[PDB]
Amino acid sequence: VSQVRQNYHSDCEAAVNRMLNLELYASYTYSSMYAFFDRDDVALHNVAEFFKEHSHEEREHAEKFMKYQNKRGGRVVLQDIKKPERDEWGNTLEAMQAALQLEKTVNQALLDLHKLATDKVDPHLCDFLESEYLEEQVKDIKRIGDFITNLKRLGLPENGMGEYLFDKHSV
């Protein structure tokens, strides 16, 4: 019943709230990876900063959905932000593989939201996803995949020297 609401389906409004939660979940997972690589017994500070940066960008992705919801006359509904799946992340390769999986999970949710927006004939929402989310996902997935290839090339997980070199030359 919002005075601004036009062509905005209840299903899309709800899916936007769920997507917001997933962005926050991703932010929290990256913050966990940051803290892990900052441990004195891990100590890969450029890797830590990479994940800290990713955490910040996910928070921005979430805020943009909040703003979107209000612009369309939907109502932001928040849920708990679940803690990350792991408390420790093994090493740079394990963490990067988890990040790849996470970005693909986020991407799948965005693609699913686009399918819903398409089904409900909401071109504004489709454009929003295409212009603000989908290409960012493809770029990040590619960058993380490239990193994984290099970490394998460097002999991870066994090759500690390789891991050191990655932190010094790749991030």
Residues that bind Mg ion (CB under 5 A): 10, 22, 130, 135
Output the known binding site for Fe cation. Answer: 23, 58, 61, 103, 137, 140
Interface pick for a second copy out of 120, 141, 157, 171 (rule CB under 8 A) = 141
Closest by alpha carbon to 166, among 53, 81, 50? 50
Shortest Å, Cβ 33 to Fe ion: 11
Could you tell me how many residues make up the chain? 171
Q: Is residue 52 within 8 Å of 32, Cβ to Cβ?
A: no
Shortest Å, Cβ 35 to a second copy: 4
* Nearest CB to a second copy, comparing residues 11 and 77: 77
What count of Cα atoms within 13 Å lies in the side-chain half-sphere of residue 79?
13
SS3 76: coil
Return the number of other C-beta atoms located less than 10 Å from residue 40's C-beta. Answer: 5
Which residue carries 């997507």 as its tokens? Answer: 19
User: From the list Cl ion, a second copy, Fe ion, none, which binds 17 (C-beta under 5 to 8 Å, kind-based)?
Assistant: Cl ion
Interface pick for Cl ion out of 102, 106, 151, 154 (rule CB under 5 A) = 102
* Nearest CB to Mg ion, comparing residues 67 and 160: 67
140 binds Fe ion (CB under 5 A): yes
Shortest Å, Cβ 113 to Fe ion: 12
Which amino acid would we find at residue 3?
A: Q
